[PDB]
Amino acid sequence: KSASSLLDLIWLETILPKTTSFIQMKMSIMVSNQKGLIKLYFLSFLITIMISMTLFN
Amino acid sequence: NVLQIVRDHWVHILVPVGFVFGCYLDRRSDEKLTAFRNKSLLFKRELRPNEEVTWK
Amino acid sequence: HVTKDMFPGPYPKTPEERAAAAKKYNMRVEDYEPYPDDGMGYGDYPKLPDRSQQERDPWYDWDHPDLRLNWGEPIHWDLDMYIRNRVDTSPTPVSWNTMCKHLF
Amino acid sequence: PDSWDKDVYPEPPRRTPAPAPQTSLPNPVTYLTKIFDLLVDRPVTLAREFIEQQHAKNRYYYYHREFRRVPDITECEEKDILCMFEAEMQWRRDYKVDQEIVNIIQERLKACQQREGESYRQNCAKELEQFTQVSKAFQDRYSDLGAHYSARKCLAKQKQRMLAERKAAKEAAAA
Amino acid sequence: IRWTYARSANIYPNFRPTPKTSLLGALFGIGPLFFWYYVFKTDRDKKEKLIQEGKLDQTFNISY
Amino acid sequence: GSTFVAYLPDYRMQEWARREAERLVKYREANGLPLMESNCFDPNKIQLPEDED
Amino acid sequence: MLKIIIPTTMLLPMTWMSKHNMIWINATVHSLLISLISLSLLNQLGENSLNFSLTFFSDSLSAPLLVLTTWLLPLMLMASQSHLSKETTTRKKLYITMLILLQLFLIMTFTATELILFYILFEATLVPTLIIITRWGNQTERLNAGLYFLFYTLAGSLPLLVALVYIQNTTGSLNFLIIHYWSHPLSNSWSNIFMWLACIMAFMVKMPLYGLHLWLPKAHVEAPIAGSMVLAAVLLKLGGYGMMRITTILNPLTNYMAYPFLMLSMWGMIMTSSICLRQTDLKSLIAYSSVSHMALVIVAIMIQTPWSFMGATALMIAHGLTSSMLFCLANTNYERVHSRTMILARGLQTLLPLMATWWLVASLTNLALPPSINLIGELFIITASFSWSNITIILMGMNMMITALYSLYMLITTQRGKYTHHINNIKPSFTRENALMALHILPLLLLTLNPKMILGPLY
Amino acid sequence: MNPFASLTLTTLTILTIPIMMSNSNIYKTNLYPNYVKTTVSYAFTLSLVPLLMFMHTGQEMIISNWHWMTLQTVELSLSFKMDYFSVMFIPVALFVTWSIMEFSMWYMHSDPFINRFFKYLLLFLITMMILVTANNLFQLFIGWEGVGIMSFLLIGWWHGRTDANTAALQAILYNRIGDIGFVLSMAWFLTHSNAWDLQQIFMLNNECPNMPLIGLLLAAAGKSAQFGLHPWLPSAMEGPTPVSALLHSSTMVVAGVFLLIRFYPLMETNKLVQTMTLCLGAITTLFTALCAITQNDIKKIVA
Amino acid sequence: TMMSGRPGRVPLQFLPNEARSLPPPKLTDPRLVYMGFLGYCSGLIDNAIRRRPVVSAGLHRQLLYVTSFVFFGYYLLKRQDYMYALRDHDMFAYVKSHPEDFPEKDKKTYGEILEEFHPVR
Numbered sequence A: 001k002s003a004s005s006l007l008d009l010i011w012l013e014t015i016l017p018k019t020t021s022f023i024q025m026k027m028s029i030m031v032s033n034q035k036g037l038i039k040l041y042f043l044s045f046l047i048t049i050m051i052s053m054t055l056f057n
Numbered sequence B: 001n002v003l004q005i006v007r008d009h010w011v012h013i014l015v016p017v018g019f020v021f022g023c024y025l026d027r028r029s030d031e032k033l034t035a036f037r038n039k040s041l042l043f044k045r046e047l048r049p050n051e052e053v054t055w056k
Numbered sequence C: 001h002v003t004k005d006m007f008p009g010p011y012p013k014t015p016e017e018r019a020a021a022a023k024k025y026n027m028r029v030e031d032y033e034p035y036p037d038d039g040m041g042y043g044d045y046p047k048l049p050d051r052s053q054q055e056r057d058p059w060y061d062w063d064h065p066d067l068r069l070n071w072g073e074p075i076h077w078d079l080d081m082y083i084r085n086r087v088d089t090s091p092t093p094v095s096w097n098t099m100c101k102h103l104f
Numbered sequence D: 001p002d003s004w005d006k007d008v009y010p011e012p013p014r015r016t017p018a019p020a021p022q023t024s025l026p027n028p029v030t031y032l033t034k035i036f037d038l039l040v041d042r043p044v045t046l047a048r049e050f051i052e053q054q055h056a057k058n059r060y061y062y063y064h065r066e067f068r069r070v071p072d073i074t075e076c077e078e079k080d081i082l083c084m085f086e087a088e089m090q091w092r093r094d095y096k097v098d099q100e101i102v103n104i105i106q107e108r109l110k111a112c113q114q115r116e117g118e119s120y121r122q123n124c125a126k127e128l129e130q131f132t133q134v135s136k137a138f139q140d141r142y143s144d145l146g147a148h149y150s151a152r153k154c155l156a157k158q159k160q161r162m163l164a165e166r167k168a169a170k171e172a173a174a175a
Numbered sequence E: 001i002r003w004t005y006a007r008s009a010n011i012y013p014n015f016r017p018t019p020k021t022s023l024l025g026a027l028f029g030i031g032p033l034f035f036w037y038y039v040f041k042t043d044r045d046k047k048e049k050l051i052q053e054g055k056l057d058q059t060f061n062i063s064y
Numbered sequence F: 001g002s003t004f005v006a007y008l009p010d011y012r013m014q015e016w017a018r019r020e021a022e023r024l025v026k027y028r029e030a031n032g033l034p035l036m037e038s039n040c041f042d043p044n045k046i047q048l049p050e051d052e053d
Numbered sequence G: 001m002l003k004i005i006i007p008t009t010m011l012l013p014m015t016w017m018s019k020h021n022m023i024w025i026n027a028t029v030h031s032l033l034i035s036l037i038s039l040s041l042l043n044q045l046g047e048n049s050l051n052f053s054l055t056f057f058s059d060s061l062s063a064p065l066l067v068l069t070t071w072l073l074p075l076m077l078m079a080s081q082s083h084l085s086k087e088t089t090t091r092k093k094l095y096i097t098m099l100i101l102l103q104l105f106l107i108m109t110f111t112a113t114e115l116i117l118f119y120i121l122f123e124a125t126l127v128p129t130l131i132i133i134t135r136w137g138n139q140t141e142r143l144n145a146g147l148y149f150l151f152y153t154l155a156g157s158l159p160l161l162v163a164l165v166y167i168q169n170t171t172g173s174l175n176f177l178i179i180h181y182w183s184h185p186l187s188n189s190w191s192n193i194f195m196w197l198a199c200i201m202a203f204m205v206k207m208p209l210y211g212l213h214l215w216l217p218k219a220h221v222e223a224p225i226a227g228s229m230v231l232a233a234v235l236l237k238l239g240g241y242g243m244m245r246i247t248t249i250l251n252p253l254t255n256y257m258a259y260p261f262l263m264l265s266m267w268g269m270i271m272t273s274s275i276c277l278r279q280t281d282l283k284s285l286i287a288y289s290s291v292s293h294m295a296l297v298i299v300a301i302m303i304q305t306p307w308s309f310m311g312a313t314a315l316m317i318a319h320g321l322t323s324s325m326l327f328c329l330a331n332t333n334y335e336r337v338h339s340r341t342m343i344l345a346r347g348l349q350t351l352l353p354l355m356a357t358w359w360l361v362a363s364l365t366n367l368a369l370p371p372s373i374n375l376i377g378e379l380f381i382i383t384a385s386f387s388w389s390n391i392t393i394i395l396m397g398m399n400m401m402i403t404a405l406y407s408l409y410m411l412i413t414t415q416r417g418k419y420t421h422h423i424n425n426i427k428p429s430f431t432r433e434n435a436l437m438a439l440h441i442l443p444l445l446l447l448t449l450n451p452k453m454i455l456g457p458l459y
Numbered sequence H: 001m002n003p004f005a006s007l008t009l010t011t012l013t014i015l016t017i018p019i020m021m022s023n024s025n026i027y028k029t030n031l032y033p034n035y036v037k038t039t040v041s042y043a044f045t046l047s048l049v050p051l052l053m054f055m056h057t058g059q060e061m062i063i064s065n066w067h068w069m070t071l072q073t074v075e076l077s078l079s080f081k082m083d084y085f086s087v088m089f090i091p092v093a094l095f096v097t098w099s100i101m102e103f104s105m106w107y108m109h110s111d112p113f114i115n116r117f118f119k120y121l122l123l124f125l126i127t128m129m130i131l132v133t134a135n136n137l138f139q140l141f142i143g144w145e146g147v148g149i150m151s152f153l154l155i156g157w158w159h160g161r162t163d164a165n166t167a168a169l170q171a172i173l174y175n176r177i178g179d180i181g182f183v184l185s186m187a188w189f190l191t192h193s194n195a196w197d198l199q200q201i202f203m204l205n206n207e208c209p210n211m212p213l214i215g216l217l218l219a220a221a222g223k224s225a226q227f228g229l230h231p232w233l234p235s236a237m238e239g240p241t242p243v244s245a246l247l248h249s250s251t252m253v254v255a256g257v258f259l260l261i262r263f264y265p266l267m268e269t270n271k272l273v274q275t276m277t278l279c280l281g282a283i284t285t286l287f288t289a290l291c292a293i294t295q296n297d298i299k300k301i302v303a
Numbered sequence I: 001t002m003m004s005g006r007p008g009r010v011p012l013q014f015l016p017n018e019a020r021s022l023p024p025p026k027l028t029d030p031r032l033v034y035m036g037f038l039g040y041c042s043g044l045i046d047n048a049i050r051r052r053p054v055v056s057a058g059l060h061r062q063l064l065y066v067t068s069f070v071f072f073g074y075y076l077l078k079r080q081d082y083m084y085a086l087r088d089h090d091m092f093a094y095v096k097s098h099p100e101d102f103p104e105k106d107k108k109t110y111g112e113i114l115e116e117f118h119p120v121r
Ligand SMILES: CCCCCCCCCCCCCCCCCC(=O)OC[C@H](COP(=O)([O-])OCC(O)COP(=O)([O-])OC[C@@H](COC(=O)CCCCCCCCCCCCCCCCC)OC(=O)CCCCCCCCCCCCCCCCC)OC(=O)CCCCCCCCCCCCCCCCC
Pocket: B014, B017, G009, G012, G013, G016, G017, G090, G091, G094, G097, G101, G104, G127, G128, G131, G135, I040, I041, I042, I044, I045, I048, I052, I053, I054, I055
């Protein structure tokens, strides 16, 4: 109940591998989900240019 | 029958030839680490009347 | 030769999937009872009575006479804990509380 | 036997009693040991004599290797690797020799305990004191270096111990 | 086959983070470690104090 | 291979170390020196730092 | 050192030029000859080491591992001969090529005078193992298993590389000899703490540590028999070798930093031994037993005493041989039954008596019966830990009891009782399998005659 | 010279020859049990001689013949102790085993694996002889575990019977509980007295502390089936009657007691451990007799 | 070590003239043998991709592969050795020309240096 199922099969699996898989999957979904509209990409580029001009100097 | 079994069993010489070549290469690498030969404070030794190097 | 539908699944919530799970494990819907739907990964598995394999009938012609099991019948979750080589729950001539108190 | 030194492994003179038969009944031990001698000891001795003459027909010798003394870790510069290598090798050899010395003293102690029989507590106090002193010295030398021990760690332990000793002596004198 | 699969490969997909499960996992997976750490740390602290004061009597202690 | 490993020459210097110890203890018992010294390195060649505290 | 490396390299052209029906014979014969050649490395000295050149050196810690690595290849070929019968000649040659590449990588890893070369080969061993697991595995989980076996390893090993190069920027060298001779104490600092963690966790993930052991049951259960043997016998010992080699620069920070890992290993040996008690899978049981034994070896290395190092060396060698034998026995059962479940094939002593004798000997040597080298390593580690702290004896006694319990449980469940009635395809054991078990077990009982050959450089 | 050592080692040596011949042709015939019985009888009549020498003179001896590994200042060697206990117990055990095998030739006449039965009996005898004559703790541990494994194999002789396997695993479990204390004692003696040899242990322990003697007491309680760990001895009656008569009645079970006899110079210098041993023995004997007076199985009563 | 701006450097010279004062690599250099082995592997892969007998399809093609690899490897090894020699020469000259930045450390024996001892317990 504890050594085999609770810790080995569930929690030790939940902490290192499953959390990593979940976080990476969520980040991949967030980053790769772009509708291909150059308007959004250009607005993001303008925001980045302004941020760098206001931050790195 | 010679010249017929050779074409089938010639692969068996590969490993022993590799072993001999490795021994030769080990001796060749040995030859390049003689900077302290007969110069150790523990084995400073006067050469024999017919001895050139303490070890090869 | 086992198909995907023959494997244990998630906890049953509706009577229809409860009957389907009972059919899967070769038991009556009335006799079927899953483990409580808690965090533990029991899922849809029958909760057979916690009786040991020692107290099963030794005169019945089982398919596995030493294990006292039949071929297609459902297997207890803790079968390897009750194998007649380990802890058994057979009734005793004296009550458990009485034995504990007397020995202590 | 000449195969080992009597001084390194001392033994008492081994006084033994004389047989004093108080009865005319003949004991089984003497007859049994005589028949054992005849049936076992003689053939073994003849085979050994044959083997010994065969060995004498072919005689050859081997020599105990001797090692020169080399400057130890105290006469080594901070980063001069050659002298540190030589000192480390010398220190390891000395460590092995000290291990063998402790082994010899322990063998003496065990032989005493078995030999003196029921009076080992009193007749083996000398060996007990010898082993106590040797063990104290060995423990002071090498007790807590641990794995990855080196001549430098041994020297550091000695320096720490002698600093403590010097401070204690100074305080006692200045008490 | 159903028994082995349910015992081995059907646990995590049916797992659900629950106060019972979280508490039991935390206890059974952390409590023993900290308990044994406290025990061993206390024992070694007492040993170190005794050896520092010199009243430990380590005669004949040569192999470690 | 087992016969080869069994008859390997003594490169670990076990018999050498034993004989060295026998000769050393024979010497030291004869002159009465107190067996093995506590100091691995002689103190006169060590230069301690003076505290002056 | 090249007298061993070059024949191993020549094993590849010979394998690829061999006739379609003579690959196994040639590979086995020449691997056995290479092992005979490698036996010469056992002649070590009480002095520094056997420094062959600037690149490769030997030691009495490296030599037993090298001998075991060379000896394992013929057994792997003999066990793989069975289930690769229906395979094309090209794919059989590719399998043998993977095995030969693994052996060459291990041989070059164990000598490795320098730490970056050691890291390069220590990671180079990953690729052939991953290919073997994910290509010639039977079930659909093998791919998943491979992913685990990869990423865990890299998760520990990429930081190590960083630490390594950092050290070479400060010390100026990564040579083992210069590192040992010029070692300086580590100040108790946060930077030094994280350097310690980076140096240590890469090897602790490969033992594996109790918290990081999840990949091992997957990789062992899913890999083919040769993969299981090479994983349990040699690949687990790479972490122990790395820790033994790298703890020299970590002192005195090891005293404080070792406590979490000591607690994890001392409790995880109990946890995994208890896990072995309730297991429906033979391979999973053997894998968890391996985890327990390597937890004990971790404790030995962390305590860092001469007796600890000797016992750890002996235990790594003994566990390698014993675990390989156990996996071979389970594979022989599986090739007949095709299920890999302990409870299904029962009463096998009545049908295969000699195989039952092999099972009994393997279980006895896994149970650490004296005077086996398993017991020698176990006892040396226990004595060193008792000197470390007298309360460890409770945990070690518990571990010994549970180990005996689950070993005899595995023996009794499969060999004793009444045979399964419906299972009728159990043929008599072949000469190949019996010879495999004999070649596994005879070296153990020969090594118990000369224990000093496997007791490491601190003997 | 002094045939004591030669005779004492020859008895144990010739106890092993049938095990060597177990792979020969005689093992495949029906003359093997008689071969083993005759070997045991000859060993007994050969070991009767050192007993006579000791009775005449009081001769005692230590034979450290083969040198095993040496770990720094610790030297391990194959060493035999031939004191009064060994030279007295060896003939008695050999005589009992001879009677047991003669009875076995009639009791197990219908057993298909009777040669293996006699091989097992001889292996147990060899392990017990190793246990009794051991001069250091490692050899004593070797015999300790050998007799336990042999009892495990002989209790589950009828491996098709579930209860026999259960009893064998029960015996292994309780004996491992004892082995915990055995290993504790070994580790303490190595760490503090720097030896597993008996002479150094006796010499360096004028006032033995509590822990090693408590470990020895735990091991003895485990192997002799005292009250804490008693049930395995009655449960071991699942084996064949010769096994119960030889191992679990008169030879193997005394081993733990024999262990405490080996360390009596150290037991006499501690009063708490002596009191614990006395109390354990008293409660064990009372409880076991109380259980016995109401049993119906004859073998259980004798156990 | 940015030696692109090193004084007196001809722009597109692969091997300068001063590089001729260095010993050329031996024709049995292990790196040259590795380059030839790379060429042989390229030949084998070329035979495999085109679906030809891998070992014995084109001997002239494999010979050309090995020869070209050996040629380029020899010249590359020459350039590498020259570049490392330049680095060492510059480092030694800079050390010689800046004595105040690289003082001679006083030789101190281990007998007079106090190192802290940490017991292993
Ligand atoms: C560590 C350093 C030391 C070792 C160095 C390692 C690298 C060295 C070699 C590098 C590559 C060069 C050659 C590879 C070309 C590929 C050709 C091929 O496939 O082989 C077929 C060919 C035989 O087949 P065939 O009858 O000609 O026609 C069949 C078709 O070719 C094809 O038949 P098929 O299409 O019907 O069969 C299909 C099969 C065919 O697919 C393949 O076999 C592909 C070939 C492997 C990929 C090559 C990758 C490039 C190199 C990377 C090496 C990585 C090493 C690092 C470690 C990580 C491992 C990945 O594919 C599959 O089965 C699909 C699944 C495959 C399983 C997963 C794939 C894993 C592949 C990884 C292999 C890496 C090691 C390769 C070793 C050599 C293999 C030939 O093999 C050979 O005969 C050539 C082998 C070498 C010739 C030796 C001659 C020298 C002996 C005489 C002189 C003595 C020397 C000493 C002098 C002094 C003595 C007196």
